[PDB]
Structure 1
Amino acid sequence: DISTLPRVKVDLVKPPFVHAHDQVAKTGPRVVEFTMTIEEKKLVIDREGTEIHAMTFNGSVPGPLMVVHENDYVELRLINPDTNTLLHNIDFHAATGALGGGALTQVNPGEETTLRFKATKPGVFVYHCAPEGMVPWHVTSGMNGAIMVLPRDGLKDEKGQPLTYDKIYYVGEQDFYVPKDEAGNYKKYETPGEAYEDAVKAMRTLTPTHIVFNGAVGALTGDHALTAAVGERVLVVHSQANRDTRPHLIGGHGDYVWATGKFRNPPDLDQETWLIPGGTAGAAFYTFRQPGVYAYVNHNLIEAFELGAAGHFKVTGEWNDDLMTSVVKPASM
């Protein structure tokens, strides 16, 4: 009886950060209340100043990571302000029924809706917008995110022993398809409706123009590099709502990886690289063992270093010369 369950209100935070939560459930099942406001906005996605009409949950690409426990109820108030011009909705891959909630959450500008669903399966899951007839346009305009449904007793390794993270980050990876003129320059439109049919032609080529983390080239670098310390246990949740990706921590590993993101399965150990299929969220657990800069990439290195799918960690601590050392620094023969 759902009336009788506790309610807790969660205030979301902007990726790659994750809202505060408990790994091990400190309460019984709850109705966990979220609100997201849909924002249609111009976003600059690259160093060149290329613009897209982005379609966002809560103003970000990706949408924020929501976190609950298995057999919690997720209750989302989804608001489509009258400053928007499109139809929106939401499909949670975590949910069961009505196209993941998409059939129940179609909101015109000036409308809102509240959906509740029971999070029966533990894992990380994609959520995305999916209005009938215009689904790939919405998703590849950035209107996707993820939800983590933790087991009530937290994550476990392949032996069933607890794995506890110190830090969690959420990397949303976005393929964009910016339409081009016949010379191959990107096009600009006053409104999203004007972009749409050219958007469909660009998507049908299947090759992205850009592939970015956290909504832009370089978003997770510099002052916005991810951070950790030697000895810290870090979970990286990574989603890709539309295309395969192959994440790799350059300088590290995934010590435990749920490549297709579902925590009732034992993790894969010691991964160099893993395949997160388009329409999936995955999670990798790593304990840093060396300080310094790491590149976290889609290991199609073209996608990473030419199209945008690369971020950095800056890791503090002491250097372990037993794990790695320069015996002879680069020098002339």
Structure 2
Amino acid sequence: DISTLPRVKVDLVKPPFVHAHDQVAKTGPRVVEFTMTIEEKKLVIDREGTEIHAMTFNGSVPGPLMVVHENDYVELRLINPDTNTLLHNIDFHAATGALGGGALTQVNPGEETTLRFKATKPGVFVYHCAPEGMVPWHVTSGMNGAIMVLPRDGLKDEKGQPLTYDKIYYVGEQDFYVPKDEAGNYKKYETPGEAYEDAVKAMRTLTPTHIVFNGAVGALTGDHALTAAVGERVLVVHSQANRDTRPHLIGGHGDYVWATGKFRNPPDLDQETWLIPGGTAGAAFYTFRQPGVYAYVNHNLIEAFELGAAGHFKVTGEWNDDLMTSVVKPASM
């Protein structure tokens, strides 16, 4: 009887940050309540000022990361304010039935709905908008995110021993297909509906114009770099709702990787690079051993360094010469 379960309301945080949670469950099963507001808005995605009409959950690309435990109930209030123009919905890959909730959550501007589903399978999962006839347009306009369903006893390594993380970040990777004129300049549109027919033609080429982390080229660089300390255990959740990706930590590894993001499976060890298939979320666990700047990339290096799928970590602490040292610094012969 779900009426007699405790309820906890959770306020979401912008990526790459993640709302507060417990790894190991300190309560019985709960109804966990979330509210998300849909926002259609203009987004500048690159240093040249290219602008798209993004379709967002809660104002961000990606949508925020939701965290619950196995056999919790997720209750989502989805609001579509009347300032928007399009019909939207939400499809949870975590959920069972009705097209992941898509068939139950169709909201025109000025409408809201409340969905509940039971989080029966532990893992990280993609969620995304999927309106009939217009699925790829919404998704590739940024309307996707992820939910993490933790095991009630938290994460385990390949030997069934606890893995505890000190920090968690959510990297959502987004392929954009911005229409071009004959010469290759990006077009501008006053309203999403204006862009529709050009968007369809752009998508059909199967060639993204931009691939970005957290909604823009350079979004996770400089002062917006991810941070950690030597000796800190970091979990990086990575989702791609539409297109394959191959994450790599330049200077590091995936010590324990769930490339396809499902925790009943043992992790892969010592990964240099792993493939997250389009429409999947994955998770990688690393203990930092060296300080300095790391780049986190899609290791199609064209996609990373030309199209935008690259971020930085800034790591503090002591340099360890046992692991790596310059024996003879670069010098003329």
TM-score normalized with structure 2 length:
1.00
Measure how far apart 1:125 and its partner are.
0.2
Measure how far apart 1:276 and its partner are.
0.2
- Paired position in structure 2 for 1:249: 249
Confirm whether residue 83 of structure 1 aligns to residue 93 of structure 2.
no
C-alpha distance after superposition, 1:269-305 (max 9, x if no partner): 0000000000000000000000000000000000000
Q: How many Å separate the matches in 2 of 1:223 and 1:12?
A: 22
Measure how far apart 1:329 and its partner are.
0.6
Map 1:39-118; keep pairs closer than 5 Å. Answer: 39-118=39-118
Q: How many Å separate the matches in 2 of 1:207 and 1:10?
A: 38
Q: Which runs of 5+ in 1 are unaligned?
A: none
2:202 match: secondary structure: helix
Measure how far apart 1:312 and its partner are.
0.2
Measure how far apart 1:106 and its partner are.
0.3
- Paired position in structure 2 for 1:185: 185
Measure how far apart 1:205 and its partner are.
0.2
2:198 match: secondary structure: helix
Measure how far apart 1:58 and its partner are.
0.1
Q: How many Å separate the matches in 2 of 1:183 and 1:96?
A: 46
C-alpha distance after superposition, 1:95-145 (max 9, x if no partner): 000000000000000000000000000000000000000000000000000
Measure how far apart 1:182 and its partner are.
1.0
C-alpha distance after superposition, 1:3-39 (max 9, x if no partner): 0101000000000000000000000000000000000
- Paired position in structure 2 for 1:305: 305
Measure how far apart 1:234 and its partner are.
0.1
1:87 match: secondary structure: coil
- Paired position in structure 2 for 1:33: 33
2:126 match: secondary structure: strand
Q: How many Å separate the matches in 1 of 2:87 and 2:326?
A: 57
Q: How many Å separate the matches in 1 of 2:200 and 2:87?
A: 17
- Paired position in structure 1 for 2:5: 5
Measure how far apart 1:173 and its partner are.
0.0
C-alpha distance after superposition, 1:173-197 (max 9, x if no partner): 0000000111111111000001001
Q: How many Å separate the matches in 2 of 1:6 and 1:320?
A: 49
Q: How many Å separate the matches in 2 of 1:71 and 1:58?
A: 25
- Paired position in structure 2 for 1:293: 293
2:203 match: secondary structure: helix
2:138 match: secondary structure: helix
Measure how far apart 1:76 and its partner are.
0.3
2:16 match: secondary structure: coil
C-alpha distance after superposition, 1:50-96 (max 9, x if no partner): 00000000000000000000000000000000000000000000000
Q: Which runs of 5+ in 2 are unaligned?
A: none
C-alpha distance after superposition, 1:239-274 (max 9, x if no partner): 000000000000000000000000000000000000
- Paired position in structure 2 for 1:268: 268
Identity %: 100
Q: How many Å separate the matches in 2 of 1:158 and 1:5?
A: 33
Q: How many Å separate the matches in 2 of 1:258 and 1:226?
A: 21
Q: How many Å separate the matches in 1 of 2:297 and 2:82?
A: 38
Q: How many Å separate the matches in 1 of 2:100 and 2:318?
A: 47
TM-score normalized with structure 1 length:
1.00
